[PDB]
From a paper:
Members of the RAS family of oncogenic proteins are frequently mutated in human cancers. [name] mutants are major drivers of cancers, such as colorectal, lung or pancreatic cancers. The [name] binding inhibits [name] nucleotide exchange and [name] dimerisation, thus impairing mutant [name]–effector interactions and the downstream signalling pathways.
The X-ray structure data of [name] and K19 in complex with KRASG12V show these DARPins bind to the allosteric lobe of [name], at the interface between helix α3/loop 7/helix α4. Analysis of the amino acids engaged in the interaction between the DARPins and [name], showed that [name] and K19 make extensive interactions with the histidine 95 and the glutamic acid 107, which are residues only present in [name]. The crystal structures show that when DARPins [name] or K19 bind to [name], a structural change appears in the [name] molecule on the effector lobe, especially on the switch 1 and 2 when compared with two unbound KRASG12V-GDP structures. However, SOS not only contacts RAS near the switch 1 and 2 regions but also makes additional interactions with the residues 95–105 of the helix α329.
Numbering used by the authors:
A (entry chain B): 1 to 156
B (entry chain A): -1 to 166
């Protein structure tokens, strides 16, 4: 049994100590499942903050991209885990990483209506001018969805 | 006749109740009374909002991890039931993978979809209402609780997906 496989299991379950122990024994922190999700993707999607922190502290690739081209910041921003967004950015997460549809974390946060996450992404260099595969910006999403406070935030 | 046919695709992980939902819709009973090689209908005529139509169900059950055939099911379909079980955390997680894959095969950010939390007749769920509601709200899609066993929400789930197709 791969140590990386054990870490993915532990990371899904939010088992803080078991995560530390597998890392202490030499588990690949960037091990990925059949979808390309790493322990960091899992911890980000499920909102396991302390696991995000220890993974990053012990050299996890903050910009690891899955088979859909999504990074942990894409996931945290769409689902609405602010504190995880903040921590990922602090370790140099690419705030404008494009998935295989051309979507950035800002597109996903805008679509989800997480306004504080949108503001935190902008403060950390997110580009409102970034276009997805279909030529749409996060601003266009806010106009299409009729989300006026979002539109105002993106226009500044 | 001329009535509209809607091809509805059921996706989700193994064991969430995709075939149970399909059989409950078409045959009007649960797994316990389902007899394969007798009950072979994959279509049902229905009235949704006063307008008669034909539902054609494209169930991915048994081909979930057969990429080629799963993508062919998706490309053929017009709307998607993204089904998880309320007592399986991994199945909820997998929703995200299926939603992204549907967007890639159909090649649109806005594809008609419904989030379905199945097995709601069971008490002590491990994926709560709020968490599922928030994910659907983050996705901009309806969330519907279903039980293939009791029929609760089953028509609602399939009918709501037709209503999503009609207004795209
Ligand atoms: N209690 C309950 N059990 C269900 C429900 N739907 C499916 N099941 C059970 O869950 C298991 C998986 O159902 P199945 O339709 O084979 O899932 P599939 O792999 O997605 O097609 C079976 O044992 C079913 O009897 C439900 O709504 N309520």
């Amino acid at each position: 049994m791969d140590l990386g496989k054990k870490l993915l299991e532990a990371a899904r379950a939010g088992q803080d100590d078991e995560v530390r122990i597998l890392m202490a024994n030499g588990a690949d922190v960037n091990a990925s499942d059949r979808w390309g999700w790493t322990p960091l993707h899992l911890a980000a999607w499920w909102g396991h903050l302390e696991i995000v922190e220890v993974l990053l502290k012990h050299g996890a690739d903050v910009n690891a991209a899955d088979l859909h081209g999504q990074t942990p910041l894409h996931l945290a921003a769409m689902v609405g885990h602010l504190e995880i967004v903040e921590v990922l950015l602090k370790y140099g997460a690419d705030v404008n990483a494009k998935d295989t549809m051309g979507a950035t974390p800002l597109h996903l946060a805008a679509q989800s209506g997480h306004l504080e996450i949108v503001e935190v992404l902008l403060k950390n260099g997110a580009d409102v001018n970034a276009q997805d595969k279909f030529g749409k910006t996060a601003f266009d999403i806010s106009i299409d969805n009729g989300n006026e406070d979002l539109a105002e935030i993106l226009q500044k | 006749s001329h009535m509209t046919e809607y091809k509805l695709v059921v996706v989700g992980a193994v064991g969430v109740g995709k075939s149970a939902l399909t059989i409950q819709l078409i045959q009007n009973h649960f797994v316990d009374e389902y007899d394969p090689t007798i009950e072979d209908s994959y279509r049902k005529q229905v009235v949704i909002d006063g307008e008669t139509c034909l539902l054609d169900i494209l169930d991915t059950a048994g081909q979930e991890e057969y990429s080629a055939m799963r993508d062919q099911y998706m490309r053929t379909g017009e709307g998607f039931l993204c089904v998880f079980a309320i007592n399986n955390t991994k199945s909820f997680e997998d929703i995200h993978h299926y939603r992204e894959q549907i967007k890639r095969v159909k090649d649109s950010e806005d594809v008609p979809m419904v989030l379905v939390g199945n097995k709601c007749d069971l008490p002590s769920r491990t994926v709560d209402t709020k968490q599922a509601q928030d994910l659907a709200r983050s996705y901009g899609i309806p969330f519907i609780e279903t039980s293939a066993k009791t029929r609760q929400g089953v028509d609602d789930a399939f009918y709501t997906l037709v209503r999503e197709i009609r207004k795209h």
